[PDB]
Amino acid sequence: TPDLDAIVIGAGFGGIYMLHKLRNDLGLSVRVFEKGGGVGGTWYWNKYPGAKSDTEGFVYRYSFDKELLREYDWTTRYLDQPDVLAYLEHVVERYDLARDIQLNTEVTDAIFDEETELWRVTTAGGETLTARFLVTALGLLSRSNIPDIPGRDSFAGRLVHTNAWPEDLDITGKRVGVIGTGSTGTQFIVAAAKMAEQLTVFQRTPQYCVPSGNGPMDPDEVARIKQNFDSIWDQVRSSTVAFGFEESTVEAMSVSESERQRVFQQAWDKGNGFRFMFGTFCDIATNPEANAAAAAFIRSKIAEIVKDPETARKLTPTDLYAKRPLCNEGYYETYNRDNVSLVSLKETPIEEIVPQGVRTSDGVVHELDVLVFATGFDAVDGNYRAMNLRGRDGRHINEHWTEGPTSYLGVTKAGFPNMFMILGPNGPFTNLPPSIEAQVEWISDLIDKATREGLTTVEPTADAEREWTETCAEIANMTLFPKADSWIFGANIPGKRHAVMFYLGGLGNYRRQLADVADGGYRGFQLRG
Ligand SMILES: Cc1cc2nc3c(=O)[nH]c(=O)nc-3n(C[C@H](O)[C@H](O)[C@H](O)COP(=O)(O)OP(=O)(O)OC[C@H]3O[C@@H](n4cnc5c(N)ncnc54)[C@H](O)[C@@H]3O)c2cc1C
Ligand SMILES: Nc1ncnc2c1ncn2[C@@H]1O[C@H](COP(=O)(O)OP(=O)(O)OC[C@H]2OC[C@H](O)[C@@H]2O)[C@@H](O)[C@H]1OP(=O)(O)O
């Protein structure tokens, strides 16, 4: 007999909903462990100025509770961090979840016992307990990556990663530097430039940013959207990227040059990064000719916006438009401010961090009070590999992942019976809340089957998992995404394996795969009583 039916790790969107399903809906005994001092995941940790959703707020929320969709108000087109956090706190209150979420608790070990067919979890505080089922909602974008830049530990001021931003830090009137220009670093830059006495941006790789279109919502428009949420969510769950817009079915090069310009400009004016990539034409990320056209449009905007042509040049990417789409309010415009400087680390790399700042290879010591690492995450697999997570035969998860992280269907793992993953390796690449929902709901159904039928283990086969790897690789190779150097394929961290880590088929196809597996008697699973 285990201590609990189930243990959930993580109290982000994922673990919150998992706890609700397993405790409230199924009536199991459940505990969540979260290493943070508060619930919210991303939206707890990322307290930096400018932190916000790039999913439009209307669909950056749960959908499973229709009354909550009716009731809950948003007032800005995108949601700032404190607003997403307050939403998640409200959900935890609504479903009486806080009583079974244990904060400040890092799980350091999770070990399957093949004799009792139970999981044993160990906390950093030195406690252990057992459960029948283990759900890891560890986050795809949660394990901070802080590069080992020479001299980093000598810096005498406030040195922080964005995912560890301290609530008390006020950068107003300070000399601030930021390393990194992905989604985090760019939205930070926009906010920080308005506060800092001087902002220095250390940019290794410029990205193709488009407008977000953010601003206030008309409350009459929020009421209309609420009235139409059924249809809105149907469209979301059937789409590829789940961002709440209709995805184009038109090949970019099938129209005239003027029509292509007009479509790109309409999207630019409407805002949203995924809208630019997938709402314009159907083949931006698959057809190099189409991709070139999209990239050219954005470069031409950069050239129009940025007044200093050297600064414009340094901001202008020349690689494939196939990193995760970025958007912001007034990003390129920020570089027209007198108090913002841009350092191209291609041209003048960092030589050394020093007590007073950062020294680049031109010998210039950039003096800083605050140095901000917007350097991203050990994405997807980082918190799995960090854990002492062992399955059958006492084998660590790392022994299974020597050519990249793997799963069956994004949510289970061969050799790890009764372990379910929320946004594990090789799952969907979308607006994440509705993918989380698909996964939580699927996992809930399988766990309930186990309960009703008296199953002691559920596990995927090694063949099924290999087949899923091949499926993901095949889909990924039909796209330009593998040729974009970013965190999505592991390439961002030195020594990390370059490998497919997402199913790139989209949410609608992903939901069908899950459904087809379940309706076919859990094709690929060994179910034992
Ligand atoms: C700044 C930022 C903005 C983003 N904006 C968007 C957006 O607009 N749209 C979108 O679709 N996605 C966005 N994302 C991705 C975002 O993480 C997801 O949308 C969603 O918040 C993921 O929820 P989750 O529960 O899967 O993971 P997370 O919110 O990452 O939560 C996982 C939690 O697990 C905890 N944890 C991990 N390991 C352990 C352990 N061993 N023991 C105990 N606790 C542990 C972590 O502390 C963390 O709190 C963004 C990410 C960032 C960083
Ligand atoms: N050693 C070193 N030196 C200099 N610069 C470095 C270094 N390591 C990383 N970086 C840069 O930091 C940035 C990290 O971006 P990203 O991984 O997208 O992380 P984000 O947090 O912005 O976004 C991740 C996701 O969170 C939410 C949403 O899905 C986002 O995509 C990027 O500009 C990197 O440049 P590089 O040269 O490109 O590697």
Author numbering: 6 to 534
Verbatim from the authors:
Cyclohexanone monooxygenase (CHMO; EC 1.14.13.22) is an FAD‐ and NADPH‐dependent Baeyer–Villiger monooxygenase (BVMO). A wide variety of ketones are converted by CHMO into esters or lactones through the insertion of an oxygen atom on one side or the other of the carbonyl group. Among the retrieved sequences, a putative CHMO from Thermocrispum municipale DSM 44069 was found (TmCHMO; NCBI RefSeq: WP_028849141.1). While AcCHMO essentially lost its activity after 25 min incubation in 14 % acetonitrile at 20 °C, TmCHMO remained highly active (>80 %) for at least 20 h under these conditions. These thermostability and solvent‐tolerance data clearly show that TmCHMO is a substantially more robust biocatalyst than AcCHMO.
For a more in‐depth understanding of TmCHMO properties, its crystal structure in complex with FAD and NADP+ in the oxidized and reduced states were solved to a resolution of 1.22 and 1.60 Å. The overall structures of the oxidized and reduced forms share an almost identical conformation, with a root mean square deviation of 0.20 Å for the backbone Cα atoms. However, inspection of the active sites shows distinct alterations. In the reduced enzyme, the electron density corresponding to the nicotinamide moiety of NADP+ is disordered, with no well‐defined electron density. Furthermore, R329 of the oxidized enzyme is engaged in H‐bonds with the carboxamide group of NADP+ and the side chain of D59. Upon enzyme reduction, R329 moves away from NADP+ and points toward the isoalloxazine moiety of the flavin ring, which favors an electrostatic interaction between the positively charged guanidinium group of R329 and the negatively charged reduced flavin. Upon formation of the flavin peroxide and concomitant loss of the negative charge on the flavin ring, R329 would shift back to the conformation interacting with the NADP+, thereby making the catalytic center accessible to a ketone substrate.23d These results confirm that the formation of the negatively charged reduced flavin is associated with a localized rearrangement of the central elements of the catalytic site.
